[PDB]
Amino acid sequence: MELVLKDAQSALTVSETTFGRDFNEALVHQVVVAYAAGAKVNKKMYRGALKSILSELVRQDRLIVVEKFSVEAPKTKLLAQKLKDMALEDVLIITGELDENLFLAARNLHKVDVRDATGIDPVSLIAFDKVVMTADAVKQVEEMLA
Amino acid sequence: LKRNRSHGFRARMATKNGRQVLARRRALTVSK
RNA sequence: UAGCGGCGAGCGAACGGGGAGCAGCCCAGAGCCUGAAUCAGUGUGUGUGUUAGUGGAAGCGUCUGGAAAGGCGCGCGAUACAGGGUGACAGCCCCGUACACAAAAAUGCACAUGCUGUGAGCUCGAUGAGUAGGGCGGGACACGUGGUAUCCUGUCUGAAUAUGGGGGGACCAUCCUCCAAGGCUAAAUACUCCUGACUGACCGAUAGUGAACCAGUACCGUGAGGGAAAGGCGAAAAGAACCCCGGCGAGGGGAGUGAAAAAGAACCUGAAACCGUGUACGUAACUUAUAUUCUGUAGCAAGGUUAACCGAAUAGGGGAGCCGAAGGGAAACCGAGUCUUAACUGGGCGUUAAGUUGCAGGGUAU
């Protein structure tokens, strides 16, 4: 399965065993309940739940991937204009290296959050229905989730 | 709290001057 | 867990592994040259705080309304949608929030600078003296002074300087370790009277500290000490100007302020045991947690799990434990079979019968 970019359709190959596996409802529910209670978590089951939620999100067509999502300058006006052009309001931006301009001009957005690959959490993914994921972050998330 | 302890009868008893003052007054200052 | 305990009630190890840190020196005495390392003090310099503070982005119409901070529309801000206040719910009304900043003077933190104090450093001696040990009577765990096995002595003794002396369960063959009998130590390691900030799926006036209130107050006792009860007007007191009935009292009855006076100072909301008015009816209380066991569910799967630790930190690094694997017999030893027996179709235990960590809950004692 190749992610839709809407501009170039240059999505890279994604391991279906990780991003396209069956959705285990019980495991995801257990992991989210444990995360809510904490806010014991095991590495393997946590990774499995992350893979399950990623597979559910991609299979629901709620995930969008672009070559590089960022802002030219650290201004919230530019980000708002870009979101308006995208015609989306509640979007979770996930990337790799922590962007400076976007992170700086993203705090005030109540319905928009920005985080890096290492900072992905089940609560963040579940909170926002739509996710915009940077292309380069695919390998990072794959290695993080094994 | 400090008055109850520092000026309490316990502290006065612990000191010779406190005992002398208490005996003189009996013949006071803390009421907890 | 081993161990201990009229082996009954019960108490309680070592080794090792992995982390923060890991600092060893001083002299006991000689020389060489040598106050050049390091530490404190003193005046100056730089950067950072603190003790006061500065700038700080964006809006209105209509309708509902006591007030709009209610929602309807079209706009903008954002490195600032943390909060508080404004006649009801505020990113654009105000203090502030991100950010940029700010000091005549003092100190704290880092070093450099001139000077004063401990004062680079190199080589060669060298062991900390009445010391190890012994004897009489005492003090501590069992002594109740000798289970005396350990420590100290009022007292009498007492050959060691890396040839020698200490320990190693007897001494001992192999050997392991140090030069005890002089001193220092700083980092990681607990505690919180009290101060700054952050909060809480914390409490709501019979709750919460005893005290949300002039509370450690009244009061109870000569004293120690004990120890209460008591919040809510509203938006601005706008606190009812003013006429009259009353004792120039109070109390209320009118007008007015008022959204409300069903907010009127004995001041938000109002229910019964209690007393009347008006109407109708018949009537002379096993809590938290270690262990035991069970239920259903999820990941991995012969692996699951990593923990005090580190962690742009609840993700990830960190295998030391943690349950079992091709097994068992006390061992040899054999191997899918094995074990005392020459052998029991005796009989016991096995064949590659997969287990673990979480999730929510049920019974037992501790």
UniProtKB/Swiss-Prot annotation, chain A:
<dbReference type="InterPro" id="IPR023574">
    <property type="entry name" value="Ribosomal_uL4_dom_sf"/>
</dbReference>
<dbReference type="GO" id="GO:2000766">
    <property type="term" value="P:negative regulation of cytoplasmic translation"/>
</dbReference>
<keyword id="KW-0804">Transcription</keyword>
<dbReference type="GO" id="GO:0005829">
    <property type="term" value="C:cytosol"/>
</dbReference>
<dbReference type="InterPro" id="IPR002136">
    <property type="entry name" value="Ribosomal_uL4"/>
</dbReference>
<dbReference type="GO" id="GO:0015934">
    <property type="term" value="C:large ribosomal subunit"/>
</dbReference>
<dbReference type="GO" id="GO:0030371">
    <property type="term" value="F:translation repressor activity"/>
</dbReference>
<keyword id="KW-0699">rRNA-binding</keyword>
<keyword id="KW-0678">Repressor</keyword>
<dbReference type="GO" id="GO:0060698">
    <property type="term" value="F:endoribonuclease inhibitor activity"/>
</dbReference>
<dbReference type="GO" id="GO:0003677">
    <property type="term" value="F:DNA binding"/>
</dbReference>
<dbReference type="GO" id="GO:0003735">
    <property type="term" value="F:structural constituent of ribosome"/>
</dbReference>
<comment type="subunit">
    <text>Part of the 50S ribosomal subunit. In TnaC-stalled ribosomes forms part of the binding pocket for L-Trp with the leader peptide and uL22.</text>
</comment>
<protein>
    <recommendedName>
        <fullName>Large ribosomal subunit protein uL4</fullName>
    </recommendedName>
</protein>
<keyword id="KW-0689">Ribosomal protein</keyword>
<dbReference type="GO" id="GO:0017148">
    <property type="term" value="P:negative regulation of translation"/>
</dbReference>
<keyword id="KW-0694">RNA-binding</keyword>
<dbReference type="GO" id="GO:0031555">
    <property type="term" value="P:transcriptional attenuation"/>
</dbReference>
<keyword id="KW-0046">Antibiotic resistance</keyword>
<dbReference type="GO" id="GO:0002181">
    <property type="term" value="P:cytoplasmic translation"/>
</dbReference>
<dbReference type="GO" id="GO:0005737">
    <property type="term" value="C:cytoplasm"/>
</dbReference>
<comment type="similarity">
    <text>Belongs to the universal ribosomal protein uL4 family.</text>
</comment>
Swiss-Prot record, chain B:
<protein>
    <recommendedName>
        <fullName>Large ribosomal subunit protein bL34</fullName>
    </recommendedName>
</protein>
<dbReference type="GO" id="GO:0003735">
    <property type="term" value="F:structural constituent of ribosome"/>
</dbReference>
<keyword id="KW-0687">Ribonucleoprotein</keyword>
<comment type="subunit">
    <text>Part of the 50S ribosomal subunit.</text>
</comment>
<comment type="similarity">
    <text>Belongs to the bacterial ribosomal protein bL34 family.</text>
</comment>
<dbReference type="GO" id="GO:0002181">
    <property type="term" value="P:cytoplasmic translation"/>
</dbReference>
<keyword id="KW-0689">Ribosomal protein</keyword>
<dbReference type="GO" id="GO:0022625">
    <property type="term" value="C:cytosolic large ribosomal subunit"/>
</dbReference>
<dbReference type="GO" id="GO:0005737">
    <property type="term" value="C:cytoplasm"/>
</dbReference>
